[PDB]
Every structure is written in structure tokens, then in C-alpha cells.
Write a protein that binds this ligand. Structure first.
Ligand SMILES: Nc1cccc(OCc2ccccc2)c1
Ligand SMILES: [Zn+2]
Length: 140
């Protein structure tokens, strides 16, 4: 589980988004596993605007922060899960790391701020849904 709180936006995994997130929907993209919803309160998370390929992510199934190398966001084939059929997920960054289903929402951070959230796992790899291309998260 997990979210980014930037401005009056909540960024979650589309597959973990609640009634209220859907009731307050701003933008959603099945192919990226992202849902942004509106919030009353103002968030403090700064989104990274950069091309960093190193970072730390939080893994609830280990209660551990792991430094990682990750790929640039790409169209990555992701096996069938309890939430999506086997398909290509867009804007996905892979690293060598531990990621179970309930690790989704774990933040990946570089020195610039939030890079994205855990979205995929399996085969000793963790997938991060990039949010750094979403410029509008920082305004309006
Ligand atoms: N590379 C880097 C530099 C500075 C901070 C940073 O934050 C890591 C982190 C903090 C809290 C939750 C999850 C991850 C990563
Ligand atoms: Zn960065």
C-alpha cells in the first residue's frame, strides 16, 4: 500500500484506488497502474523532475529501504497478476529487488524527490510506475 501527496493530488496504484479516490478522480491510466485523485489538505511530497537512474525505494514486505539502479521508463511486458492480465505496462522502471503485491505504493525517491511507486514484482525484480513525466502534478 502507499501514495504520493503533492499539492491537492493523491497518486496511488490504479489497482489499489478506493471508492473516494474514484469519487474524486482527476486522471487514471490502466496501462501505467496510476490514479490521481483530489485531496482537501495540501501534500508536501516534491515530484522529481530529472533523468536519475538511482534511488531508494521502501519495501513493506522487508520493512527496508533499498538503494537501487532502475531502468528508464519503458513499455515492459508484465505477467498476469491478481489485478491485471499479462500485458505491456507503460512508463515502467525495473530494478533488481524484492517486491510482493502488497509492496505496491512503496515510494522510489532520488535526491530530487519522488520518482514513482512500486507497481510490479516477480522474478526478483521490482517495477516502479514513473510519475516524473506528469508535470501538472506541480501546479493547478
Ligand atoms: N537517493 C535518495 C536521496 C535522498 C533521499 C532518498 O529518499 C529515500 C527514501 C526516503 C523515504 C522513503 C523511501 C525512500 C533517496
Ligand atoms: Zn533525480
Amino acid at each position: 500500500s502507499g501514495a504520493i501527496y503533492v499539492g491537492n493530488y493523491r497518486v496511488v496504484n490504479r489497482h489499489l484506488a478506493t471508492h473516494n479516490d474514484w469519487a474524486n478522480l482527476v486522471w487514471e491510466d490502466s496501462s501505467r497502474d496510476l490514479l490521481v485523485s483530489s485531496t482537501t489538505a495540501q501534500g508536501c511530497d516534491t515530484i522529481a523532475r530529472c533523468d536519475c537512474q538511482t534511488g531508494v525505494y521502501y519495501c513493506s514486505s522487508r520493512r527496508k529501504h533499498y538503494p537501487v539502479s532502475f531502468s528508464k521508463p519503458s513499455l515492459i511486458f508484465v505477467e498476469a497478476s491478481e489485478y491485471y492480465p499479462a500485458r505491456y505496462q507503460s512508463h515502467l522502471m525495473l530494478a533488481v529487488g524484492h517486491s510482493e503485491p502488497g509492496d505496491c505504493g512503496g515510494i522510489l525517491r532520488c535526491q530530487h524527490g519522488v520518482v514513482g511507486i512500486v507497481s510490479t514484482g516477480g522474478n526478483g525484480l521490482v517495477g516502479f510506475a514513473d510519475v516524473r513525466d506528469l508535470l501538472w502534478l506541480d501546479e493547478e
